Amino acid sequence: EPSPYVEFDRRQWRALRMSTPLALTEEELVGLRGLGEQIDLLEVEEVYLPLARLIHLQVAARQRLFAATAEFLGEPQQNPDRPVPFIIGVAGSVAVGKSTTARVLQALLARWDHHPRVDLVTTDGFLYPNAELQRRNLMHRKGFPESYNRRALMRFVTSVKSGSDYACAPVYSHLHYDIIPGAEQVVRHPDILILEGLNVLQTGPTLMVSDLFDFSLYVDARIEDIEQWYVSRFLAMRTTAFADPESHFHHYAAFSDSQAVVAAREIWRTINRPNLVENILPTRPRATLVLRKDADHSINRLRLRKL
Amino acid sequence: EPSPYVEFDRRQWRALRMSTPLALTEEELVGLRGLGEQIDLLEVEEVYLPLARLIHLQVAARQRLFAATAEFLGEPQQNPDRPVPFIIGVAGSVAVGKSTTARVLQALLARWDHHPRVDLVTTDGFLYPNAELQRRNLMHRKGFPESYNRRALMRFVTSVKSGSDYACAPVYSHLHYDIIPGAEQVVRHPDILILEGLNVLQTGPTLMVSDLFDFSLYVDARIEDIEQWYVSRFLAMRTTAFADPESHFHHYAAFSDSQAVVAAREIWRTINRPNLVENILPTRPRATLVLRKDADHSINRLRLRKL
Ligand SMILES: Nc1ncnc2c1ncn2[C@@H]1O[C@H](COP(=O)(O)OP(=O)(O)O)[C@@H](O)[C@H]1O
Numbered sequence: 001e002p003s004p005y006v007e008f009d010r011r012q013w014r015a016l017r018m019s020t021p022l023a024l025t026e027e028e029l030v031g032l033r034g035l036g037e038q039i040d041l042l043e044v045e046e047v048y049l050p051l052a053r054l055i056h057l058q059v060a061a062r063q064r065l066f067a068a069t070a071e072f073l074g075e076p077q078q079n080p081d082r083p084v085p086f087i088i089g090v091a092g093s094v095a096v097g098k099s100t101t102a103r104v105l106q107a108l109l110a111r112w113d114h115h116p117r118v119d120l121v122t123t124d125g126f127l128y129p130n131a132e133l134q135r136r137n138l139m140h141r142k143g144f145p146e147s148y149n150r151r152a153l154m155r156f157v158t159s160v161k162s163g164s165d166y167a168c169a170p171v172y173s174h175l176h177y178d179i180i181p182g183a184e185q186v187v188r189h190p191d192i193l194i195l196e197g198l199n200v201l202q203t204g205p206t207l208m209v210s211d212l213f214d215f216s217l218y219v220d221a222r223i224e225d226i227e228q229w230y231v232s233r234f235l236a237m238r239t240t241a242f243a244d245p246e247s248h249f250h251h252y253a254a255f256s257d258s259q260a261v262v263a264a265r266e267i268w269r270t271i272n273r274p275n276l277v278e279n280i281l282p283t284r285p286r287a288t289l290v291l292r293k294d295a296d297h298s299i300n301r302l303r304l305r306k307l
Numbered sequence: 308e309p310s311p312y313v314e315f316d317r318r319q320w321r322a323l324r325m326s327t328p329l330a331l332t333e334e335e336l337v338g339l340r341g342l343g344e345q346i347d348l349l350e351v352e353e354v355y356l357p358l359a360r361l362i363h364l365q366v367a368a369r370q371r372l373f374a375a376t377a378e379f380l381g382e383p384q385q386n387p388d389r390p391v392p393f394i395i396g397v398a399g400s401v402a403v404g405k406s407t408t409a410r411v412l413q414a415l416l417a418r419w420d421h422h423p424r425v426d427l428v429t430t431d432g433f434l435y436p437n438a439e440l441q442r443r444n445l446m447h448r449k450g451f452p453e454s455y456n457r458r459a460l461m462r463f464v465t466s467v468k469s470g471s472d473y474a475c476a477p478v479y480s481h482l483h484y485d486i487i488p489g490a491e492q493v494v495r496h497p498d499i500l501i502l503e504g505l506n507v508l509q510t511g512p513t514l515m516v517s518d519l520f521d522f523s524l525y526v527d528a529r530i531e532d533i534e535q536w537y538v539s540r541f542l543a544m545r546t547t548a549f550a551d552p553e554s555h556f557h558h559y560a561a562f563s564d565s566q567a568v569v570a571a572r573e574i575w576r577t578i579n580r581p582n583l584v585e586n587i588l589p590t591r592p593r594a595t596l597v598l599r600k601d602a603d604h605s606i607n608r609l610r611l612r613k614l
């Protein structure tokens with residue numbers, strides 16, 4: 001039976017790397033991975049390099065596509081130095097490694113000879129402020145579709161892909177657990193934009209951001225494995241993030257392995273798991289490429305969307 | 308504020324026709340329109356011709372796109388005489404003229420110099436048989452998402468776009484109001500496939516048909532105007548379709564204008580309107596091109612998706 005997909009194991013996937021060059025040191029790579037992520041240069045070669053290639057083969061191809069509409073409408077032509085921004089989306093559960101994958105990807109893509117302006121934006125900054133969240137009674141739904149100002153989010157990406165000179169996005173603080181007053185991230189007509197978020201790939205009664213993606217990634221892994229990464233990281237943060245007195249979570253630093261595990265699991269059980277099951281996972285089918293990571297965080301399976 | 312859309316009035320739209328040739332007589336056009344549709348050669352020139360152009364500009368462009376993935380995967384190349392089928396979807400309410408628009412489009416596209424194999428398939432044949440509908444208690448939800456064997460529908464389109472030599476689809480009888488036993492529509496690797504249906508443009512927790520469209524159309528019009536076309540056509544069918552003794556609706560032929568109007572409205576109120584409002588209209592935002600028709604069935608506004 002025919003399928004819209006094609007799957008590989010790392011062995012099959014790596015052979016598609018070809019000549020793509022590795023332009024990242026093992027040290028640069030470090031400042032790119034988040035706590036708990038195992039990414040090393042090898043994985044960047046057998047997995048991220050082919051991927052970088054695929055994306056580059058499509059950037060050109062995807063443009064012939066907008067050219068047509070421009071030609072059809074009988075408009076000016078190029079401005080080879082201001083084409084239509086290539087939008088890439090990275091989706092996946094909390095603690096699955098999206099940020100690592102997105103930062104690495106941005107590092108690889110920016111380090112290509114064109115030296116493209118590759119901007120990265122997370123939907124974090126599009127959550128509603130805690131005050132506003134409390135108003136709607138959503139302080140325990142942070143991450144669910146309704147906890148984001150999607151109108152703003154959509155306005156943003158649309159602006160960037162429609163060729164605006166610059167666009168602004170609010171900024172979220174993981175330290176204070178809230179939106180930073182007056183903080184803004186300005187994006188100036190990038191060549192490529194990477195939007196990272198749990199709910200980037202979702203669809204709805206209104207034109208959404210997933211409808212503006214030219215390529216998409218879904219970082220996947222077993223649910224019990226992700227809970228594990230989540231709990232584990234929670235305990236680990238007792239001495240890194242939580243250790244800071246300014247942290248909205250400083251009280252967890254004192255917890256014992258045992259209590260921390262109990263706490264980490266309750267949050268996972270009442271917030272992140274339900275959201276992953278009800279909102280995130282149902283979007284996985286639409287991702288151009290799904291990266292299957294096993295229990296050790298290693299990506300060794302991939303599902304590509306050819307149709 | 309930037310938008311993913313661009314709108315035109317017929318005046319602006321017609322100028323994009325250019326040189327596109329009219330290869331249809333006023334007589335050929337006739338056997339293409341359904342009862343009540345006002346389409347004439349003029350509209351085919353000021354509206355359908357530009358559209359035919361746009362589509363042709365994209366067929367080429369859309370292919371450079373699959374080429375890339377083929378090149379990336381390091382596969383054989385062309386077979387210029389078996390490229391990836393261009394899938395087009397035509398959505399819209401019951402009685403809005405989809406079938407006319409789809410048949411005309413197919414006529415125009417087939418009559419292009421390449422003389423492409425342009426097949427047209429309606430989702431009608433993918434409804435569940437009345438017996439099966441009765442089992443699920445859906446005899447009054449015919450047209451709603453759940454009244455279709457979408458797995459089959461998806462299997463079909465996927466097969467055709469994945470390059471199969473041929474694919475089969477069941478056949479629906481408007482006369483007997485049910486699926487025709489043993490009837491099948493065989494589609495052989497067309498160059499272009501047009502899928503016509505109320506719910507073609509919808510999205511869901513699973514990869515769907517709308518996800519395989521390379522271009523899409525949404526025939527629109529005011530809701531009170533469509534009800535009008537529906538009721539009006541119901542009465543008109545008393546002497547055409549319903550007049551046949553074999554019709555599952557032959558009993559309506561006898562109705563008086565007044566009773567028929569009462570009946571037509573109850574069906575519209577309890578079936579077609581709810582479905583249009585709850586399922587069809589919410590998909591309009593995702594259509595590549597929306598054709599706004601006014602009360603006289605004339606299309607004089609269009610909304611194009613550039614993003
Ligand atoms: N409470 C926290 N305090 C500080 N940093 C955090 C906190 N929670 C998560 N982070 C970091 O911010 C990012 C959050 O990632 P998550 O939201 O867990 O998605 P993912 O792990 O897939 O990137 C990661 O870099 C994570 O290490």
Ligand SMILES: Nc1ncnc2c1ncn2[C@@H]1O[C@H](COP(=O)(O)OP(=O)(O)O)[C@@H](O)[C@H]1O
Binds near residue numbers: 342399400401481556
């Ligand atoms: N009860 C019926 N009997 C015979 N033909 C019908 C009947 N209802 C609709 N048709 C015809 O079949 C097609 C049904 O179209 P509809 O399902 O009303 O969508 P649309 O009008 O947008 O094409 C049209 O050609 C219509 O004229």
